[PDB]
């Protein structure tokens, strides 16, 4: 058997930031739509729409774009609600960006993040999406089976 969800978590509010120059806005949107669908049919509560549309940004601006987008999205929520997930599209070879982004999200914004490399975003394979959904589920407090 493959791993599956036991308890699906909840992602009611999420956003996407893209850092790859090969990824146009509608590809980021489509990728996130398909990932959201996979998360839902696997057993999560997962909003099919993000709080804000995807934004594309330069890696060098990572701190500022994360903080600005976090603030803008959070401000759009009903009072007291918080962002559950940031989906980040990253260049395949991104140097210090991955580590910088995880530090900022974990220790400054306090938001769960799921990174997805450009090469996988183009393909949107079922198996890839299923694995990412499993990872998101654990990060937001869900529980998966073990092999």
Please, is 93 exposed, middle or buried when counting C-beta atoms within 10 Å of its C-beta (0-12, 13-18, 19+)? exposed
CATH class of 1-147: alpha beta
Interatomic CA distance for residues 10 and 77, integer angstroms:
16
Distances in Å between the alpha carbon of 108 and those of 12, 54, 134?
21, 21, 25
- What resolution in Å is listed for this PDB structure? 1.4
Closest CA to 44 of 147, 114, 117, 104: 114
DSSP per-residue string spanning 47-72: -SS-SS--EE--GGGHHHHHHHHHHH
Instruction: Decide if 70 contacts 96 (C-beta within 8 A).
Output: no
How many whole angstroms separate alpha carbon 127 and alpha carbon 39? Answer: 12
d(CA 103, CA 110): 10
Method of determination used here: X-ray
Distance CA 145, CA 147 (A): 7
Domain extents in the chain: 1-147
34 Cβ partners below 8 Å, 6+ apart? Answer: 124, 129
């Amino acid at each position: 058997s493959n791993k599956k969800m036991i308890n699906g978590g909840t992602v009611n509010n999420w956003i996407c930031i893209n850092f790859s120059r090969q990824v146009q806005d509608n590809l980021a949107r489509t990728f996130c739509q398909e990932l959201a669908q996979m998360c839902y049919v696997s057993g999560m509560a997962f909003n099919p729409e993000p709080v804000l549309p995807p934004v594309s940004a330069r890696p060098e601006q990572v701190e500022k774009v994360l903080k600005t987008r976090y603030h803008d999205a959070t401000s759009k929520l009903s009072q007291g609600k918080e962002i559950d997930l940031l989906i980040v599209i990253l260049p395949d070879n991104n140097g210090s960006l991955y580590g910088d982004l995880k530090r900022i999200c974990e220790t400054e914004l306090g938001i769960v993040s799921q990174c997805c490399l450009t090469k996988h975003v183009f393909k949107m394979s079922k198996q890839y999406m299923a694995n990412v959904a499993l990872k998101i589920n654990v990060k937001v407090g869900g529980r998966n089976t073990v092999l």
